[PDB]
Amino acid sequence: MRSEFASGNTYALYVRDTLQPGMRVRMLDDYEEISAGDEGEFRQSNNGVPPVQVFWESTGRTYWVHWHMLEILGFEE
């Protein structure tokens, strides 16, 4: 996947730059309460660590997700 990078942390970096509050996201991996295919919006992130604050639409819950499992659907505007 895009996390193809050696540790995949570069992917976290790549996405973090473009993922600003308002960029829509899709859950690419299935994890805990969240399920693969869930779609949501990027509210905010912790600018240096994996935890990202995303609001998932289909569930209706805000969750701290992981950069490497986020599919970008941004530029919706």
CA–centroid distance for 11 within its chain: 11
Walk me through the domains of the chain, giving residue ranges and CATH numbers.
1-77 (2.30.30.30)
State the structure-solving technique.
NMR
Instruction: Identify the helix (H) or strand (E) that includes residue 13.
Output: helix 9-18
d(CA 52, CA 70): 10
42 Cβ neighbours under 8 A, 6+ residues apart? 19, 20, 21, 22, 23, 24, 25, 52, 54, 74
